[PDB]
Amino acid sequence: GWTLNSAGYLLGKINLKALAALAKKIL
């Protein structure tokens, strides 16, 4: 990891999952 390959599309397809947790908390 830690490369353009990561930011490629691994900074959303995941954060989107954790977001549901962050949006569930802030909610």
Q: Which technique?
A: NMR
Query: Is the C-alpha dihedral spanning 26, 23, 12, 1 positive or negative?
Result: positive
Maximum CA extent, the chain: 33
Delimit the domains of the chain by residue range: 1-27
Helices (H), strands (E): how many in the chain? 2, 0
Q: For residues 8 and 22, give the distance between their C-alpha atoms in angstroms, rounded to a whole number.
A: 22
**Residue 14 corresponds to which tokens in the numbers above?**
């995941």
Region of residue 9 (phi > 0: left; psi between -120 and 50: alpha; otherwise: beta)? alpha
Q: For residues 4 and 15, give the distance between their C-alpha atoms in angstroms, rounded to a whole number.
A: 17
**Residue 16 corresponds to which tokens in the numbers above?**
């989107």
